């Protein structure tokens, strides 16, 4: 459960404690982070995430590894972060077709700057049950109706007419 927060694929799992509301069952948001070494800039001395929880925010992926930030006061830089999709519809783009894996935004520039961020989260992987109070309660924002209001609203005419006039040449 909360104490079992390690994976055998080289992934140290940061079990995010979350507020178990009536849409949940103190919930353990099980997300892993595997130290990847490849050509991607997110793998540059950083850990590629795995099993990314949904309903993302500005720092929800940082709050998934927030036991490192809630205890060691994590301060670092950022190089890259990818393999994150809201619904998986970004695999085939409209312009691309006509002409690691499930990783959240849990990465950094290197490992020396992330010694308080990534190495502390690896320490918080074993201390997910030992430092659950240091782990922040992942009580993210509710899904408001304004996101569906802006999605179904009409778009600006001048936002597309400026791009049409620029691409006309």
């Amino acid at each position: 459960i909360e104490d079992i927060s390690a994976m055998k694929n080289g992934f140290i799992v940061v079990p995010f404690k979350l507020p178990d509301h009536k849409a949940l069952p103190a919930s353990l948001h099980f997300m892993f982070a595997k130290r990847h070494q490849s050509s991607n800039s997110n793998e540059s001395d950083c850990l590629f995430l795995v099993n990314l929880p949904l309903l993302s925010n500005i720092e929800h992926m940082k709050k998934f590894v927030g036991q490192l930030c809630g205890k060691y006061d994590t301060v670092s830089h950022v190089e890259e972060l990818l393999y994150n999709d809201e619904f998986g519809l970004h695999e085939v783009d409209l312009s691309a077709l006509t002409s690691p894996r499930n990783t959240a935004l849990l990465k950094f520039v290197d490992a020396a700057s992330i010694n308080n961020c990534w190495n502390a989260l690896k320490k918080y992987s074993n201390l997910h049950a030992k430092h659950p109070n240091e782990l922040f309660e992942w009580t993210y924002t509710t899904p408001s109706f304004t996101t569906f209001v802006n999605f179904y609203k009409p778009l600006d005419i001048d936002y597309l007419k400026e791009d049409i006039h620029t691409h006309m040449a």
């Binding site: 099980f30 085939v92 992942w138 009580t139 179904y152 005419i157």
Partner: protein, 1082 residues
């Protein structure tokens, strides 16, 4: 011949359902031999009068069911003695008429009253009926002792029964219950004591001569006297015709199959019941057709016709017959056979030398329904497009009474005792009137049919009545078969009339009726009395005079019940209330638009949809009149305004309805100079589109316009669509579709990688999902909507049932809209669309017949007399077979959506889940069975409209504050367009969009299933989103250790884990926190 070969293969598979057994035939032959030996022991009794017969078997345990009235010596002008019984090996076993069908059959015996008991002098005034009954009652004592030697009383029983629902005609009940036992045959018996051969002359058995001279035309007394006198002569002529014709057995098998398909038998038809056209009718009709002598005295058929040729000939001659209102027939013993074209408007075929009116057991009212069914049967026999050769012959009309009948009006007939018949019934019959209409089911039904013909007139296509409560088992201890049927000493409990109404001529509720003039027409002057008090003679539109019949049409109740209440209480009697309570219970449960005169207008009135279509046509004409620098081609609507057959009609000024926007597809001119890229072609083609979108708000300020990309299409969100808002606030979607999707799938598909090679044609598939032939489909839907007006309420009832069941959210909407027109465009092998509940039941039966795992669906769009040929349908059948071979379980395409414009079969049937479709088909079959089991009421209406909505992964029970019921038009006043597009989008309920986004993100593991009609499923609240949970097997357990597969594999086990339930619940915690009611981990 292909017709003479494929018909035998199609009939041999269903021939096992009516096949015979050799062991059953041997057991029946042993039972018949024991019955013949028992009947031979009944000798002639002594010479007895009526008083001496009353001295023998008055208070007997075995007494005969004497014909009405009670046995008294008031009419004892002759004697009554038991004579020597005569039996022979005849009946149903003489021509093997017994068939072991799914409902079984019975048998007949050669039994009749002898000439010593029945006399020709006693034939007048029904005096021989009392003499034959007293002879049968005296012989019943010998029947219980001397003729009771069947030696099978452990398995069989002996009892008296009535034949053809009449106490005069008896039926012998000697059969094995569930030595002389007939348990292997599993059939019954029937035998009476009728008149001898040539007992009554044809002058005394004429139509104007009644045997019970009390005289008018006896429709039952003279018919049964002629039937009893010439039963053996007709059977010998039928046996001689069966001996002459080699294919007479195949013709009788096809005639029995057609009678089973029509739901009719050889029972009484003129006595307010279904019957007449059965085995007895087909034995004389096929014999007269093969012997020739038609209306022109020509050879109708011969013995040289084949089995399928005579079956097609009998189907053609059924619609081309002339017996009731177009002619009559006259057959000799075997001297001649000829017919005439003298239409007497009544079923009668008076034989030449056999001296029997053949069609007198039937009625012209039953023949009107029979001729209507035979015309569709002859048209289906002529049609060689549909492969329903076995389907049409085996589809019983009476198998689904709710589906085959649009409406039925049933009332309770409290007939009372013999001195209480004047309370509920007012059928005042005199001397000759009671001679022809002695039965309460004959006198009152003829008065009801005359009132229905005088008031409705052309508003009824056919007349069919039923009298429930008629006792069949004759009480030997009592006088006759009389039971407490609806608080009556007589056997008459309830009366039910099937409203077979032509919908075109029955569309008048308050309009002109019987036309009057200077000459006082008897129909026009008595139109007020015929319609109750309603149809008083008023003025007409063209300056003439016409009656004004008063009927009330409702969207929550039936108009037949209001017409019956107006034209029976003040016309015949107010002691009966015949109405359909399920019609009012289903129409009130069906949704209606929020417009004026919604309850005043019925479902056939589409003035709100016509006004919305006229406003869209005026906007399209203004757009066509307006010219810009970029040329266009066409602007065709395919939305809800162009459909007008949704769950609800166009409500007045709907603000945020789920179907508020009417889709209109606009096409530009030839602009192939744009690039192959989707974003590059959109920027190149928007040189004048931005100016057109800006000028549409000025030149068409009554409407509105916008420019927004649509995210409904897959991998295509670089467009500009106009969200047109009406001055009242009605929505419209002017979407411009280009040819870049088809160009990229054909010419620019080489640039797609291995991850986009199968998705290279997905851009064209998303573009052609609703714009390939939708303009031609919307153009052809106007003729279908004009022809089948009740198909729109049937589609509305089907969409409301699918919204309540919550099983139509995992598929598209084009296939669901096009599937409801099958029972109206192709009514065979059932009835046409006459009611919304009957159309929805036929659609559920057609969906159950088209089993997605077994037989992929296929259909052709045929205009109402377009239709595709068999070679054209061979490609659709080959595509359906290829789809079934590729997906036997139907995980990607369960049922093939095959049409004339969709020969592939997967045009709008892609991505439908196999277990969701199997559960929806099982729920629809269960709800159809539950609605039939729950009678006809609101519980039966809610049997198909109350899903369980539980026992799932996630229970459908939410609480949301975004209530938009009044904006959606679903009641528990906006009259203008909204101020902002974001305010209009926020006015609707976003819980359905959040549930759809959660179901799209977790479609692999935890599918949040719902209904397509969000407004219909919401109703009064319109805020809570029902999300039924469908859980895959990798939602709580352990799966394969694959962290590179982009799954939700995290630490629960070491590495072999699945998508964790606690992680999924915490992921959906923030998405469901705004509507936090009840959801947890798997």
């Amino acid at each position: 011949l292909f017709k003479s070969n494929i018909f035998k293969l199609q009939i041999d598979e269903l021939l096992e359902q009516v096949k015979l057994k050799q062991k059953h035939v041997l057991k029946v032959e042993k039972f018949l031999h024991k019955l013949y030996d028992i009947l031979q022991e009944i000798p002639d009794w002594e010479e007895k009068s009526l008083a001496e017969v009353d001295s023998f078997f008055k208070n007997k345990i075995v007494s005969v069911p004497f014909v009405d009235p009670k046995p008294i010596p008031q009419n004892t002008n002759y004697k009554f003695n038991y004579k020597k019984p005569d039996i022979s090996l005849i009946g149903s076993f003489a021509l093997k008429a017994g068939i072991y069908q799914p409902n079984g059959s019975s048998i007949d015996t050669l039994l009749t009253m002898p000439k010593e008991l029945f006399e020709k002098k006693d034939f007048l005034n029904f005096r021989c009926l009392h003499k034959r009954s007293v002879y049968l009652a005296y012989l019943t004592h010998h029947l219980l002792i001397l003729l009771k030697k069947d030696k099978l009383d452990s398995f069989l029983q002996l009892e008296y029964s009535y034949f053809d629902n009449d106490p005069l005609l008896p039926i012998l009940r000697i059969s094995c219950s569930k030595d002389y036992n007939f348990y292997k045959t599993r059939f019954s018996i029937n035998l009476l004591i009728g008149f001898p051969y040539k007992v009554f002359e044809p002058k005394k058995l004429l139509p104007n001569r009644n045997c019970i001279r009390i005289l008018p035309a006896t429709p039952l007394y003279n018919f049964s006297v002629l039937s009893s006198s010439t039963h053996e002569n007709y059977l010998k002529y039928l046996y001689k015709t069966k001996k002459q014709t080699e294919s007479f057995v195949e013709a009788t098998v096809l005639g029995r199959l057609w009678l089973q398909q029509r739901g009719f038998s050889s029972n009484m038809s003129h006595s307010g019941s279904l019957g007449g056209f059965g085995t007895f009718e087909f034995t004389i009709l096929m014999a007269a057709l093969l012997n020739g002598g038609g209306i022109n005295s020509n050879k109708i058929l011969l013995h040289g016709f084949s089995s399928y040729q005579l079956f097609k000939g009998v189907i053609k001659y059924l619609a081309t017959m002339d017996l009731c209102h177009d002619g009559h027939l006259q057959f000799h013993s075997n001297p001649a056979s000829k017919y005439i074209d003298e239409g007497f408007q009544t079923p009668t075929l008076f034989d030449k030398s056999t001296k029997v009116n053949i069609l007198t057991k039937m009625t012209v009212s039953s023949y009107q329904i029979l001729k209507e069914y035979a015309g569709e049967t002859l048209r289906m026999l002529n049609n060689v497009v549909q492969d329903q050769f076995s389907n049409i012959f085996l589809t019983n009309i009476s198998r689904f009474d709710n589906l085959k009948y649009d409406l039925c009006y049933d009332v309770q007939l409290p007939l009372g005792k013999y001195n209480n018949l004047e309370t509920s019934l007012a059928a005042t019959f005199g001397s000759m009137e009671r001679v022809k209409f002695i039965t309460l089911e004959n006198f009152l039904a003829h008065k009801i049919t005359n009132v229905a013909r005088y008031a409705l007139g052309d508003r009824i296509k056919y007349i069919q009545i039923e009298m429930v409560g008629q006792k069949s088992d004759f009480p030997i201890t009592k006088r006759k078969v009389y039971s407490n049927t609806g608080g009556n000493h007589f056997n008459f409990d309830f009366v039910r009339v099937k409203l077979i109404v032509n919908p075109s001529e029955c569309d008048k509720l308050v309009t002109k009726g019987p036309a009057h003039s200077e000459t006082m027409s008897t129909e026009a002057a008595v139109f007020k009395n015929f319609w109750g008090i309603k149809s008083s003679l008023r003025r007409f539109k063209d300056g003439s005079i016409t009656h004004c019949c008063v009927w009330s049409t409702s969207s929550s109740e039936p108009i037949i019940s209001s017409i019956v209440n107006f034209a029976l209480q003040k016309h015949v009697s107010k002691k009966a209330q015949i109405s359909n309570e399920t019609i009012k219970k289903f129409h009130n449960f069906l949704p209606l638009p929020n417009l004026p005169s919604s309850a005043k207008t019925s479902v056939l009135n589409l003035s709100s949809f016509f006004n919305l279509k006229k406003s869209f046509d005026d906007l399209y004409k203004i757009i066509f009149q307006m010219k810009l620098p970029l040329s266009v081609k066409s602007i065709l609507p395919v939305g809800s305004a162009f459909r007008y057959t949704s769950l609800c009609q166009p409500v007045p000024f709907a603000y945020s309805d789920p179907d508020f926007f009417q889709d209109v597809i606009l096409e530009f001119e030839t602009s192939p100079k744009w690039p192959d890229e989707i974003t590059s072609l959109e920027k190149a083609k928007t040189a004048f589109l931005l100016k057109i979108q800006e000028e549409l708000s000025a030149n068409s300020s009554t409407y509105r316009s916008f420019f927004s990309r649509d995210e409904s299409i897959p991998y295509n969100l670089e467009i500009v669509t106009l969200n047109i808002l009406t001055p009242e606030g009605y929505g419209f979607k002017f979407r411009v579709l280009t040819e870049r999707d088809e160009i990229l799938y054909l010419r620019a598909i080489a640039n797609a990688r291995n991850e986009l090679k199968p998705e290279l044609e997905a851009t064209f598939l998303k573009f052609t999902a609703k714009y390939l032939a939708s303009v031609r489909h919307t153009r052809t839907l106007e003729n279908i909507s004009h022809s089948y007006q009740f198909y729109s309420p049937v589609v509305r009832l089907f969409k409301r049932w699918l919204d309540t069941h919550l099983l139509l959210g995992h598929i598209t909407d084009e296939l669901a809209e096009l599937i409801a027109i099958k029972p109206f465009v192709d009514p065979a092998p059932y009835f046409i669309p006459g009611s919304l509940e009957n159309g929805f039941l036929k659609v559920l039966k057609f969906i159950s017949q088209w089993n997605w795992k077994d037989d992929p669906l296929i259909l052709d769009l045929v205009k109402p007399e377009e239709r595709l040929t068999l070679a054209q349908y061979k490609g659709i059948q080959m595509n359906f077979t290829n789809l079934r071979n590729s997906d036997p379980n139907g995980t990607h395409l369960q049922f093939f959506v095959a049409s004339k414009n969709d020969p592939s079969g997967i045009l709008y049937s892609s991505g439908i889940p196999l277990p969701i479709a199997t559960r929806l088909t099982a729920l629809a079959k269960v709800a159809v069975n539950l609605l039939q089991t729950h009678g006809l009421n609101q519980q039966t209406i809610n049997l198909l409209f109350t899903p369980g909505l539980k026992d799932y992964d996630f229970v459908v029970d939410l609480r949301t504050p975004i209530g938009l019921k009044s904006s959606c038009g679903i009641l528990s006043a906006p009259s203008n367009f909204p101020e902002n597009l974001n305010d209009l989008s926020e006015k609707m309920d976003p819980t359905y969009q959040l549930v759809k986004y959660l179901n799209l993100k977790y479609k692999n593991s935890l599918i949040l299933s719902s209904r397509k009609y969000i407004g219909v499923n919401g109703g009064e609240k319109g805020d809570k989103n029902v999300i039924t949970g469908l859980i895959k097997p990798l939602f709580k357990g352990a799966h394969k250790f694959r962290v590179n597969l982009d799954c939700n594999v995290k630490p629960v086990d070491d590495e072999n884990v699945i998508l964790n339930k606690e992680a999924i619940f915490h992921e959906i915690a923030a998405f469901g926190n705004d509507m936090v009611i009840n959801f947890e981990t798997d």
